[PDB]
């Protein structure tokens, strides 16, 4: 539905996740690429 209770604009690709900014969203990407 259409209601105003909602924090999160980006969402992960990998666990089905969802963050409020890219970078709570960014450095979490990390846990699947192996970059680290
Ligand atoms: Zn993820």
Redesign the pocket.
Known sequence: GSSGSSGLLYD?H??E?KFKNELDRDR??L??GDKW
Do not use: K, L, N, S
Request: net charge positive.
């Open positions: 992960c990998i666990c996740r979490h990407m846990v699947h």
